[PDB]
Each structure stands twice: as C-alpha cells, then as structure tokens.
Design an enzyme around this catalytic site. Structure first.
Site, mmCIF file in Angstrom:
data_model
loop_
_atom_site.group_PDB
_atom_site.id
_atom_site.type_symbol
_atom_site.label_atom_id
_atom_site.label_comp_id
_atom_site.label_asym_id
_atom_site.label_seq_id
_atom_site.Cartn_x
_atom_site.Cartn_y
_atom_site.Cartn_z
ATOM 1 N N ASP D 43 0.841 -1.191 0.000
ATOM 2 C CA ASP D 43 0.000 0.000 0.000
ATOM 3 C C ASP D 43 0.884 1.251 0.000
ATOM 4 O O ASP D 43 2.111 1.172 -0.095
ATOM 5 C CB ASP D 43 -0.976 -0.020 1.181
HETATM 6 C C1 LIG Z 1 7.763 13.699 15.917
HETATM 7 C C2 LIG Z 1 6.495 14.553 15.926
HETATM 8 C C3 LIG Z 1 5.448 14.185 14.851
HETATM 9 C C4 LIG Z 1 4.017 13.932 15.395
HETATM 10 C C5 LIG Z 1 2.866 14.669 14.655
HETATM 11 C C6 LIG Z 1 1.490 13.932 14.606
HETATM 12 C C7 LIG Z 1 1.357 12.785 13.552
HETATM 13 C C8 LIG Z 1 -0.095 12.348 13.176
HETATM 14 C C9 LIG Z 1 -0.823 11.392 14.181
HETATM 15 C C10 LIG Z 1 -2.076 10.651 13.612
HETATM 16 C C11 LIG Z 1 -2.390 10.886 12.106
HETATM 17 C C12 LIG Z 1 -3.717 10.299 11.612
HETATM 18 O O1 LIG Z 1 -4.340 9.519 12.282
HETATM 19 S S1 LIG Z 1 -4.358 10.809 9.949
HETATM 20 C C13 LIG Z 1 -6.006 10.031 9.491
HETATM 21 C C14 LIG Z 1 -5.864 8.917 8.421
HETATM 22 N N1 LIG Z 1 -7.124 8.452 7.811
HETATM 23 C C15 LIG Z 1 -7.404 8.527 6.445
HETATM 24 O O2 LIG Z 1 -6.550 9.005 5.704
HETATM 25 C C16 LIG Z 1 -8.739 8.017 5.909
HETATM 26 C C17 LIG Z 1 -8.793 7.673 4.398
HETATM 27 N N2 LIG Z 1 -7.648 6.873 3.937
HETATM 28 C C18 LIG Z 1 -7.069 7.061 2.665
HETATM 29 O O3 LIG Z 1 -7.583 7.928 1.970
HETATM 30 C C19 LIG Z 1 -5.861 6.214 2.165
HETATM 31 O O4 LIG Z 1 -6.223 4.917 2.488
HETATM 32 C C20 LIG Z 1 -4.486 6.534 2.826
HETATM 33 C C21 LIG Z 1 -4.573 6.446 4.343
HETATM 34 C C22 LIG Z 1 -4.087 7.935 2.398
HETATM 35 C C23 LIG Z 1 -3.356 5.500 2.319
HETATM 36 O O5 LIG Z 1 -3.371 5.424 0.993
HETATM 37 P P1 LIG Z 1 -2.476 4.108 0.067
HETATM 38 O O6 LIG Z 1 -2.775 2.899 0.922
HETATM 39 O O7 LIG Z 1 -3.198 4.202 -1.250
HETATM 40 O O8 LIG Z 1 -1.035 4.575 0.079
#
Ligand SMILES: CCCCCCCCCCCC(=O)SCCNC(=O)CCNC(=O)[C@H](O)C(C)(C)COP(=O)(O)O
Ligand SMILES: CCCCCCCCCCCCCCCCCC(=O)OC[C@H](COP(=O)([O-])OCC(O)COP(=O)([O-])OC[C@@H](COC(=O)CCCCCCCCCCCCCCCCC)OC(=O)CCCCCCCCCCCCCCCCC)OC(=O)CCCCCCCCCCCCCCCCC
Ligand SMILES: CCCCCCCCCCCCCCCCC[C@@H](O)O[C@H](CO[C@H](O)CCCCCCCCCCCCCCC)COP(=O)(O)OCC[N+](C)(C)C
Ligand SMILES: CCCCCCCCCCCCCCCCC[C@@H](O)O[C@H](CO[C@H](O)CCCCCCCCCCCCCCC)COP(=O)(O)OCC[N+](C)(C)C
Ligand SMILES: CCCCCCCC/C=C\CCCCCCCC(=O)O[C@H](COC(=O)CCCCCCC/C=C/CCCCCCCC)COP(=O)(O)OCCN
Lengths: 459, 52, 56, 88, 178, 69, 175
Positions: D43
């Site tokens: 992925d």
């Molecule tokens: C060191 C200090 C840094 C800390 C900063 C904070 C970091 C962030 C913490 C938490 C972040 C989250 O939860 S962010 C929320 C994440 N949720 C989603 O994105 C929902 C929909 N998903 C999609 O559109 C795709 O599946 C995708 C995921 C893009 C993959 O794509 P591929 O599979 O096609 O590559």
C-alpha cells in the site's frame, strides 16, 4: 596657465581635421598628454597661491580638481567610443567637441581670480552638458531631465549674480585676493541674511543639498556614460569649490545661518543612504550615494574648520574617482543587456571574474575602506563635526552603516548568486573596459601614498 | 607618480622643522619659554585708553 | 614617401605647438608684472657683478 | 580524494539490497521491475517507507511530488542515476 | 522537481506527506535507531487506526487535528540532508555551474585545445537546429486551442523525433561541475 | 576519469593583465634602475652654512638630486 | 648619532646592565645574536661602506634658507595692501614654525613615555609640563581662528584677551 588652456583649445581643430577612423586615437593621446602637462600644478608654495597673472591663479584646492578634470577627459573618451560606433563622423566630432568645450570651461572656472569670471564660466559649463544629455541620451525622459538640470541650477545662480554685482559695487572689487585681505564681518541684519542666502544657494543646489537634489537622479540616470562621468566626478565639486571661495566674506553670519543646512545635510544623507537600500535601477543607487557623499561635504564646508576643509577636499576627489568608476561599471552591464534593472542580470562573477574584481574594489572604495582617501576625508569631516558637537557621531555612524549596507547589497545583487538562465549574450570583457576600470582605480590607490596632494590649502 | 613623489619641498616643511629646532634650542638654552601666549608684541599695540 | 603621411598625420603638431605658445605667452605675461622686482622688503638684494635682473 | 564515481550496477544492487532487507517482500519474489502495488501487494504507506529507506541509503532527499511515482525498483534506479548524473 | 505539478493535492497525497513529515521529525527527536524504529511502528499503528474511514468529513477533521499536533510537537531543529533546501550544502556548487553557451565565446586558441569535444559539440548543435522546427510543430499539434492546461510535455512520437523542449534539460551543466 | 570543464573564456582577461603588466614594467623598470643608480652614485646633499657674500640658486635649497633637477 | 642636535632631542645616559649568568646552560639568544651579526650585519655594513665610498667622490651642499624680519600686521595701515601681504606671509611662516615646535615637544613626550616603561607617570612629569605650557601658548595664539584665518583675526583675538586681562587686573587692583 596658458600652457594648459591653449592645448585644450588646440584639441578642437585637431579633432576636426582628423580622419574618420583616427578621431578617438588622436583625442585620447593628446588628452593624456594634456593631463600629464597639467600634473605639474601640484607644486604649491604653502604660504600663498601661485598667481600666474591678473586673470588666473592656482591653489592647493584648485590643482587636484584641475588634474582630476584633465584625467577624466580621456576616460570619458574611452567610455564613449563603444556606444557611438554607429554614429556619423560629423556627430562624433561634435560629441568630442562638446567634451573639449566642457573641459575648457572647467579648467578656466577653477583658476579665475575674480568672481564674475568664475560665475560666467560656471554658468557656461551648463550648455555642453545640456546638449550632451538631451542629444545623446538614450531614453525619452532625457528632455525632462535636462529641463530639471538647467532650471534647478539657474534658479539658484541668478541671485548669486545679483549679489556679486552688489558686492562689487559696495566693496569696489571682486578679485579673490582683495576679497580675502579686505574682509569685514557681516552684521546681523535682514539685508545681510539675504545676501548670505544669495551667495550660498547656487552652490547649495550644485552639490546638491538634500531637498534640492531632485534634478540629480534624473540627469545622472538619463545622460550617456560620459555625461554621467562628468556630472558625478567634476560638476558636483563646483558647488563645494564655490562655497570654499565665498565663505571668506560671510563671517560671522555663517555661525547661525548654517543651522538649517547642517540639519538638512545630516538627515538627508541618512535619507539618501536609506533610499539606496530600495532601488530597482542601478544608476539611481549610484546617484543617491553621490548625494549622500556631497551632503557630508556640505556639512564639512559649513562647519568652517581647517580639518573640515581638508576632509572635504579629500572626499571630493575620492568621490569623483569612485563615482566615475561605478558609473562605468554599470554602463558595461547595461551595454551587455540593454537594461538598467539591477536584478535582471545576476551572478556575473561566474561569467566575468576580472570585472567582478573591479566591482569589488569600487564597492570597497565606496564604503571608504582604510587607508583609502575616501575614509581619510570622511574621518577628517567626522572628527571636525565631533568637535563641532559630540552628538553628530550618531548620524555619522548610522550613515557609515547604511553606506556599507547598500554598497555590499549592490555588489551581492549584481555579482553573486546564480546567473540568469535566458540571458546568453554576455561576451567576455573587452580590453577597453578593463583598461578603463584600471585607469579609474590605480590613481585612487596611488593617492594613498601621498595624501597631502589632495588635502588642500589648510594642510 | 615619480614626478609628484620627487616634487621639491616648496611647501617649506623641512625649513619649518629646522627653524623650529633652532628656536627651541635657543629658547631652552636660556631658560626662555618655548612659546608666548601673545603672537604680536604688546608694545606696538595701542588699546583704547579707558574701558569704563 | 613622406608627402602622404605628412598630409594624413600633420594634425599631431597642433597640441605641442599650442603648449609651446602657451609657455611663451606665460613668459610674456610674467614680463608685465615686474613693478616690484628686487623691491620687496623680504627679498630685496644686491645684484651680482654680472647679473642684470633677479628674475625674468 | 573523495568517494569513487557511482555506477548503474551499484545503484541497482544497493536498491535490491535495501528491498531484500524489507520484511514484507519475498527475497525470491522480488525483481527489478517488480511493481510495488500490483506484484508485491503493498500500500501507499509501505511505498513511503521504501522511499524514506532509499533516502537513508543514498543520503539524499527525494521530493514528495517525484517519490509518488516510484512504483518499481527500476524507476528508483533511473531517478537516482539521472539526479547524480550517472550515465554508465 | 522533475514532474509537472497538479492543480491541487488530494486528501491521499496530503495524508502521505503528513505521514512522511511526522516520521522524519520523530526520527529527529528519536536519535537512536532502535528507539526510532519502535516509535515509528507506533506511529504507523496510530496512522493505520483510521485507514479504512469512509466519512470524508471526519477524515478531514482527523487530518486537521493531526496537522495541529504535528505543528505543536515538531522538532525546532529537524535533521536536513546537506543538499536539501535547508541543508548546509544546498547551493554550495552553484558558483561552479557555467552555461554551455559560454563555450561559443571561447578564443580560437582556446578551442585549439580540446578539438574532438568541440567537433562533437558541433554535432549536437546541428542536431538541435535540425530538430527545433519539428519540436515546435509537434507542440502546436498536441496543444488544445485554449492553451496548455498543465506543465506536462509530450514525448517524441515519430521515427527521428526528439521530445520537444529538450535542449536545456539534456544540457544541464552538472551537479558537481568542477 | 577526466571530464571537460565548462568555463567562461579566460583568454581576454589574461591578455589584458599581461598587456597592462608589460607596459607598466616597460616604463617603470628603467625608472627604478635610474633611481637606484642616482641614489648610489649621486647621493643626497649635506647641510652647509651659506658662505660669506654668497647667494645660492633656488634649486640649491633642496637636498635630493632628483628634486633639485 | 651626531646627525641631529642632542639638545632638541635629548635622552638619558642609557644605563644598561652587564650579563651575570647563573647556570651552565648556554644562552640561545647570544648564539642567535652572533649568527645574526655574522650573517646580516657584516654584509650590510660592507654594502654601506661601498655606498659611502661612492658618495664621498661626489660631494655637494644644500643650504637652509634665511628669511628677513619684515614689519608685522600691527604696524600696517588699514588699506596698505603690500605691507598687509608681507605681514600675512610672515605670520603664516611663524604659524608653521610654531606647529613644528609643538610637534617637537610632542615627539619628546612620546619618546619619554615609551622609554620610561612602567614608571612613565613619574619620570615624564617634566616633558608633560613642557607640553602643557606649549599647548596653552599655542591654543591662546591660534585656537578658534577657524578656516580662512589671518593675522588680522589673530591680532583681534589677542586684543580681546588683552582687554579682558586688563579689566580683570584693574578690578583686582581695587580689591
Ligand atoms: C515527531 C512529531 C510528529 C508527530 C505529529 C502527529 C502525527 C499524526 C498522528 C495521527 C495521524 C492520523 O491519524 S491521519 C487520518 C488517516 N485516515 C485517512 O486518511 C482516511 C482515508 N484513507 C485514505 O484515503 C488512504 O487509504 C491513505 C490512508 C491515504 C493511504 O493510501 P495508500 O494505501 O493508497 O497509500
Ligand atoms: C596588504 C597585503 C600587502 C601585499 C603586498 C603587495 C600587494 C600588491 C597589490 C597592489 C594593489 C592591487 C591592485 C588592485 C586591482 C586588482 C588587481 C587584479 O585585477 O588582479 C589581477 C591578478 C591576477 O589574478 P587572476 O588569477 O588572473 O584572476 C583574478 C580574478 O579576477 C579574481 O581574483 P581575486 O578574487 O583574488 O581579486 C583580486 C584581489 C585584488 O582586489 C583588491 O581589492 C586589492 C586592492 C585592495 C583594496 C583596495 C581598496 C581598499 C583601500 C586600500 C588602499 C591601499 C592603497 C595602498 C597603496 C597601493 C599602491 C597602488 O582581490 C583580493 O585579493 C581581495 C581584496 C581584499 C583586500 C583587503 C586589504 C585591506 C587593506 C590592507 C592593507 C592596505 C594598506 C597597506 C599598509 C597598511 C599598514 C602597514 O590578481 C592579483 O594579483 C591579486 C592582487 C593582490 C591582492 C592585493 C590585496 C592587498 C593590496 C592592497 C594595496 C597594496 C598596498 C602596498 C603597500 C605595502 C603593504
Ligand atoms: C528644501 C530645501 C530648500 C533650501 C532651504 C533653505 C533654508 C532657508 C532658511 C533660512 C535660515 C534662517 C533665516 C533667518 C535667521 C532667523 C529667522 C527668524 O526666524 O529668526 C528670528 C527673527 O524674528 C522673526 O522670526 C522674524 C521672521 C518671521 C518671518 C519669516 C517667515 C518664516 C516662515 C517659514 C517660511 C518657509 C521659508 C522657506 C521657503 C522654501 C530671530 O529673532 P530676532 O533676533 O528678533 O531677528 C534677528 C534679525 N535681526 C537682527 C535683523 C533683527
Ligand atoms: C596585479 C598584480 C598585483 C600583484 C603585484 C603587486 C606588486 C607590489 C605592489 C605593492 C607596492 C607597494 C608600494 C609601497 C610604496 C613604495 C614607494 C613609496 O614609498 O613612494 C611613495 C610615492 O608616492 C607618490 O609620491 C604619490 C603618488 C602620486 C599619484 C599621481 C598619479 C598620477 C596622476 C593620474 C591622474 C590622477 C587623477 C586624480 C588626481 C587628483 C611615497 O613617497 P614618499 O615616502 O613621500 O617619498 C620619500 C622619498 N622622496 C620624498 C624623496 C620621494
Ligand atoms: C532652485 C532653488 C534655489 C533657490 C535659491 C533662491 C534663494 C536666493 C537668495 C535670495 C535671493 C534674493 C537676494 C537678493 C540679492 C542680495 C543683495 C542684497 O544684499 O541687497 C539687500 C536687499 O535685500 C532684499 O531686497 C531681499 C528681499 C527678497 C527679494 C525676493 C524675495 C524672494 C524670496 C526670498 C526668500 C527665499 C530665498 C531662500 C530660498 C532658497 C530656495 C528655497 C540689501 O540691500 P539694500 O537695499 O541696499 O539695504 C541696505 C541699505 N538700506
């Protein structure tokens, strides 16, 4: 003094009788010879001046200016012949004739014994400069620039004529020796105040004083390269020379009549140095730097101390040479890219290393690096101002900082970074341009070994 | 530059130094002050007779 | 052989001749200001047995 | 002097080395042209981690706009070769 | 740097870029390799927690909250590769890059040295001059009437055609030109 | 292996430098040698009192031979 | 040497101690001094001897110019331009001579400060008071004249000072 004037006049039929392909060579050779001859006036007696005759005399103040003019003429000829290659023979001869007439008027102006002759020649310098600017200027704003340059000068100069004839009527003479030996104090009256103003404002506007300086950017930017060279190097110094000659009879009034001019000069040198920090045109920055240096010269003349006059003379000579070199350096790039915008051509050090060295040396002399004569004059003026008042050091230091700032800003913008990609017509530097820069810079460094040649009569 | 460097001392600085040396030697050889606060002789000056 | 080069290079004498003429006129101008020659209280002098003037 | 000039064979060998040190990829299965999304069943996060591992391997950063399209080892090798001016 | 940008970034692209930035800043915070690996797997797990979200609004809100968390907890002095736009060697060798058109201004004595190089340069110049018109014609053909919509350029499609606008891309000076 | 280095033309700056050095030396080496010869063989004058009834010339009030000339 | 007058530029008798070694270790400064002597001071001395031999064969003299004493500005009538000019030239010459006198005194002070080392504050009091006296005299003569100075302005300054001093003395006489 005729041994200088007559060859300068002979330059005219010599260039009018030359072949179409030999005018530049002949004019340059004989101008250099005339400069060599004029170099003999530096032998000064000390106590008094060299009085050749009733009409002309030489001083420790006049001699460096005369040598500078005679040396500037061949550099003007070397700089001019590149952009005038497509011109007809008659028009090139007319241009050289304008330059020769300007030199003749300048050399006669600095040696006149009597103030009306000085005024006549000092006004006569206007016509060749106006013709050069309005005929061989490149842009359409040269007409407006010439009108500004003419009328700013004349509006100040006519009251000087009235004051001079009134003074000759009241005293009986205007010969500088009689003027100095029979000097009497000026009382505190409105008539004397207006006489002081009429004697001062013409030289004020020729410096130029801040607030009366608007003609200078127009005229210096819109003129051809030789016109800018002569405007910055020599024609600005006419006001300072006139002030040094005329303030002999203005005491003790100058003690308080100089306050607004000192305030204007200090704050305006700060203002013009700041203005140089935000300028999109390369020639305007050099013009405004000239304005700041001449403001410092105005302060030096106004405070009326021997150290101040010595510093003012040194600064006039050094500024003339440095400003001429900077204008030539800008003109080379303009001839390359046909535009005056500073950020158009960048990173020129990668393409032109020796020209970058010339740029660095000119920028270092502009910021008055020791032990150059620029800092000699500036330091003498600053010390004299400190004696005048200890609070002047704040403005002097601020001006020094801003001067270094915009000088290195210009150097970094034009020479450093990466080159502009699409500009591909930057040819290697010609022998003529490098020789012109060397002939500008070498006398500056050689004058450091013998600073007393340019320190003036008060030495 | 050579001509300017070898210009004769018409400015009278070596002469001034020699004159100063002579005057200083003569003045401290006799206990006289090295310089007077008066540039011109008071005996040839005729001030106004009354100041009030 | 020299005719044509003279005709095309005669212009190179104007300035030296002007210089010589200027020096000559400077001497003539000096000749008109001899009112106080050997008459100043500082430089008044007794003439040498063979000299006619103190300066010319 | 400095490090010897880089070559295409060395770039490809190092890329395959880094990919064979990845746990979610079969060493036998992996090939230079093996697609990441299609053939290896990976992925986008795994591709981001692979790009970061390549940056750590070669000591230079690949911009995100360009790293988005490196979906096989051959593309990574080509990108590295073209950026460091490697022609043989 | 090499790819034509798009009009906008998708939610997926923003999510991956935030993931990469968070990983890099965590590596900056976690100097040692084992601790960095541990916290990077923890970050990956927390990131995959919302992998299969279908509501775009809540996904966008999660992205905004994650960006706020990253900004508050970012490293003030993150590690930068030396040649990167913030690195200590970013534009170090830019002063050594001289454009190829400067070689035409060389003196004939300078070109007496290096004869084969200049013969091959003449070959390259003939190639460019003989391909330019076809490049222009192809660009005119493959372009919509209302001007190009993106900064993408088409490849060559004929037998002896070269991709349009190739001279200044092929003739880059170098990355270490001296 | 050896690669070509793309540089701006250095022929003209080098030629200008050689020409300037050549002319400066051509004129200034004879002057330096002449000054050395004059200083070694015709030294500076030494101070002396003015003899009785004698008036010196104007150039005899300076001590360096070149300045005197 | 004897080239300059030792009364205008005096110096103490230059007392120096004799070496009193305390260890058998050889002194490297003495060996280096001998090497420097034999390698530098002898060739230089020989070259100077040859130069002086060449100079002796060509001996000529230059003289110090003497200037008569002409009447000063006090004995010139108001509009006599020639007497005024000669008096002004004499005054300028005297101004230069006074500047050189102050320069000589300043050179004495600087030499004393360098020579006396750590005891300059005590052993240079005489030079300091000499400089104070000459500085006061030079200031009273020439200070605040400004540029475009002249003998007439110096005379006016002197007359103003004389008037002030006479008024002060007269008012003290009534006290
Ligand atoms: C060191 C200090 C840094 C800390 C900063 C904070 C970091 C962030 C913490 C938490 C972040 C989250 O939860 S962010 C929320 C994440 N949720 C989603 O994105 C929902 C929909 N998903 C999609 O559109 C795709 O599946 C995708 C995921 C893009 C993959 O794509 P591929 O599979 O096609 O590559
Ligand atoms: C102090 C050292 C003493 C050394 C003794 C000998 C010095 C002889 C030099 C003579 C004057 C130089 C002429 C200037 C024009 C440029 C020449 C040129 O084009 O280069 C071609 C030539 C060929 O090179 P290239 O491979 O073909 O390519 C060159 C590229 O273009 C690019 O090449 P680049 O990038 O290398 O640039 C060339 C170079 C040249 O560019 C310059 O800027 C050099 C000029 C210095 C700055 C000028 C304005 C600043 C005000 C100082 C005024 C001093 C005047 C003194 C009298 C001078 C007499 C003429 O630039 C620099 O090196 C950096 C400049 C920084 C200088 C900082 C000095 C500050 C003051 C130091 C003391 C000054 C007073 C001395 C006494 C003090 C008390 C004891 O290059 C050189 O030869 C380099 C020049 C040598 C550097 C001189 C720097 C110090 C000298 C200052 C004056 C000398 C005083 C002597 C008195 C005794 C001491
Ligand atoms: C942009 C730059 C342009 C150039 C700048 C030129 C600067 C010119 C300014 C001239 C400096 C001062 C002029 C005269 C000195 C004093 C002026 C006056 O204000 O002082 C008082 C004068 O008193 C009153 O103020 C009278 C003047 C009032 C009328 C003048 C109008 C001023 C308004 C400003 C107009 C702007 C002028 C510049 C136009 C461009 C002093 O009181 P008093 O001791 O009793 O009078 C002394 C004169 N005595 C001896 C003859 C008796
Ligand atoms: C590019 C390669 C660069 C590297 C090569 C560099 C080589 C070495 C460079 C360093 C040289 C350092 C030289 C240091 C000076 C030595 C000579 C110096 O002492 O002479 C000076 C001489 O300097 C000249 O006098 C002053 C220069 C005059 C300049 C006139 C220029 C000609 C006019 C050009 C036009 C000017 C236009 C503007 C004029 C206002 C000072 O003279 P002074 O100590 O007293 O003389 C004592 C003995 N005397 C009096 C009997 C002679
Ligand atoms: C381009 C910008 C430059 C502007 C400079 C203009 C300022 C010039 C200075 C004033 C000009 C007029 C001066 C007159 C000539 C002086 C001669 C003189 O001293 O005569 C006075 C005469 O004085 C006057 O008449 C002056 C009156 C002013 C006439 C014109 C006024 C115009 C505006 C004046 C103020 C502006 C001047 C400074 C401004 C500078 C530029 C902003 C006394 O003579 P008597 O009558 O015999 O008196 C003694 C016996 N009872």
């Amino acid at each position: 003094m005729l041994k200088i004037i007559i060859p300068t006049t002979m330059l005219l039929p010599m260039t009018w009788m030359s072949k179409h392909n030999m005018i530049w060579i002949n004019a340059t050779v004989h101008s250099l010879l005339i400069s060599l001859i004029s170099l003999s006036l530096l032998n000064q007696l000390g106590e008094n001046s060299l009085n050749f005759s009733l009409t002309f005399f030489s001083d420790s103040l006049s001699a460096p200016l005369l040598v500078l003019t005679t040396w500037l003429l061949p550099l003007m000829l070397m700089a001019s012949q590149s952009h005038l290659s497509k011109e007809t023979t008659t028009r090139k001869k007319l241009y050289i004739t304008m330059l020769i007439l300007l030199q003749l008027f300048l050399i006669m102006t600095f040696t006149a014994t009597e103030l009306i002759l000085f005024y006549i020649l000092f006004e006569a310098t206007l016509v060749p400069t106006l013709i050069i600017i309005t005929r061989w200027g490149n842009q359409t704003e040269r007409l407006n620039a010439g009108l500004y340059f003419l009328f700013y000068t004349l509006a100040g100069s006519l009251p000087l004529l009235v004051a001079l004839v009134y003074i000759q009527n009241t005293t009986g003479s205007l010969n500088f020796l009689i003027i100095h030996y029979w000097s009497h104090p000026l009382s505190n009256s409105w008539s004397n105040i207006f006489m002081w103003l009429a004697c001062i404002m013409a030289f004020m506007v020729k410096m130029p004083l801040y607030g009366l300086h608007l003609w200078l950017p127009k005229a210096h930017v819109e003129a051809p390269i030789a016109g800018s060279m002569v405007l910055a190097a020599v024609l600005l110094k006419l006001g300072g020379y006139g002030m040094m000659r005329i303030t002999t009879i203005l005491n003790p009034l100058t003690n308080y009549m100089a306050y607004p001019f000192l305030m204007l000069s200090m704050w305006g040198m700060i203002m013009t140095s700041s203005i140089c920090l935000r300028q999109t045109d390369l020639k305007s920055l050099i013009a405004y730097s000239s304005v700041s240096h001449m403001a410092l010269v105005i302060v030096a003349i106004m405070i009326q101390t021997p150290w101040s006059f010595m510093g003012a003379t040194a600064l006039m000579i050094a500024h003339g040479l440095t400003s001429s070199m900077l204008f030539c350096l800008a003109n080379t790039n303009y001839e390359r890219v046909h535009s005056r915008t500073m950020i158009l051509a960048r990173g020129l050090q990668t393409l032109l290393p020796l020209m970058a060295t010339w740029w660095l040396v000119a920028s270092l002399t502009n910021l008055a690096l020791p032990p150059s004569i620029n800092l000699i004059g500036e330091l003498f003026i600053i010390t004299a101002s400190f004696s005048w008042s200890n609070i002047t050091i704040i403005l002097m230091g601020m001006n020094m900082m801003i001067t270094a700032l915009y000088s290195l800003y210009m150097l970094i913008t034009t020479q450093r970074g990466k080159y502009t990609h699409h500009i591909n017509n930057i040819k290697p530097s010609f022998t003529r341009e490098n020789a012109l820069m060397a002939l500008h810079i070498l006398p500056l460094l050689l004058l450091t070994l013998n600073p007393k040649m340019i320190l003036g009569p008060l030495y | 530059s050579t001509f300017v460097a070898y210009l004769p001392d018409y400015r009278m600085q070596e002469w001034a130094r020699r004159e100063a040396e002579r005057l200083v030697k003569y003045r401290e050889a006799n206990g006289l002050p090295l310089m007077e606060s008066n540039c011109f002789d008071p005996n040839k000056i005729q001030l106004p007779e009354d100041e009030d | 052989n020299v005719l044509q080069i003279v005709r095309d290079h005669w212009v190179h004498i104007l300035v030296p001749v002007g210089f010589v003429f200027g020096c000559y006129l400077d001497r003539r101008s000096d000749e008109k200001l001899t009112a106080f020659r050997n008459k100043s209280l500082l430089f008044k002098r007794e003439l040498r047995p063979n000299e006619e003037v103190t300066w010319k | 002097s400095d490090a010897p000039p880089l070559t295409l064979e060395a770039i490809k060998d190092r890329v395959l080395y880094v990919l064979k040190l990845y746990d979610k990829i079969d060493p036998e299965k992996l090939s230079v042209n093996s697609h990441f999304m299609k053939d290896l069943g990976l992925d986008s996060l795994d591709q981001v981690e692979i790009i970061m591992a390549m940056e750590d391997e070669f000591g230079f950063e690949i911009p995100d706009i360009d790293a988005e399209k490196l979906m096989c080892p051959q593309e990574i090798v080509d990108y590295i070769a073209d950026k460091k001016d490697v022609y043989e | 740097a090499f790819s034509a940008p798009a009009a906008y970034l998708t939610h997926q692209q923003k999510v991956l870029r935030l993931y990469k930035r968070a990983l890099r800043h965590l590596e900056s915070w976690c100097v040692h390799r084992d601790k960095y690996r541990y916290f990077a797997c923890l970050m990956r797990a927390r990131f995959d927690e919302h992998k299969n979200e279908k509501d775009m609004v809540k996904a966008t809100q999660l992205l905004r909250q994650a960006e706020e968390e990253f900004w508050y907890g970012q490293h003030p002095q993150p590690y930068i590769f030396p040649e990167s736009p913030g690195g200590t060697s970013y534009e170090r060798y830019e002063c050594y890059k001289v454009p190829e058109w400067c070689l035409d201004d060389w003196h004939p004595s300078e070109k007496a040295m290096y004869p084969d190089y200049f013969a091959k340069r003449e070959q390259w110049k003939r190639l460019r001059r003989e391909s330019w018109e076809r490049e222009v014609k192809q660009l005119q053909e493959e372009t919509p009437p209302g001007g190009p919509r993106t900064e993408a350029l088409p490849p060559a499609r004929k037998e002896g055609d070269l991709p349009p606008l190739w001279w200044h891309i092929v003739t880059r000076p170098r990355e270490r030109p001296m | 292996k050896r690669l070509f280095i793309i540089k701006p033309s250095g022929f003209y700056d080098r030629r200008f430098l050689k020409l300037m050095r050549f002319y400066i030396l051509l004129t200034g080496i004879p002057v330096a040698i002449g000054i050395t010869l004059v200083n070694v063989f015709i030294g500076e004058a030494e101070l002396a009192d003015i003899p009785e009834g004698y008036v010196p010339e104007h150039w005899e009030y300076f001590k360096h031979p070149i300045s005197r000339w | 040497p004897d080239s300059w007058d030792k009364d205008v530029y005096p110096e103490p008798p230059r007392r120096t101690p004799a070496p009193a070694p305390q260890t058998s270790l050889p002194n490297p400064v003495t060996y280096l001094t001998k090497i420097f002597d034999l390698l530098v001071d002898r060739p230089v001395t020989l070259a100077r001897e040859f130069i002086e031999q060449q100079h002796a064969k060509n001996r000529y003299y230059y003289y110090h110019r003497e200037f008569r004493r002409v009447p000063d500005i006090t004995e010139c009538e108001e509009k006599d331009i020639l007497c005024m000019f000669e008096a002004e030239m004499q005054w300028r010459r005297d101004y230069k001579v006074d500047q050189e006198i102050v320069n000589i005194i300043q050179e004495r002070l600087k030499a004393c400060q360098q020579r006396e080392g750590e005891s300059y504050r005590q052993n240079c009091a005489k030079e300091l008071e000499q400089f104070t006296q000459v500085s006061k005299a030079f200031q009273d003569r020439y200070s605040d004249l400004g540029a475009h100075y002249s003998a007439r302005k110096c005379l006016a300054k002197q007359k103003q000072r004389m008037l002030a001093e006479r008024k002060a003395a007269k008012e003290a006489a009534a006290a």
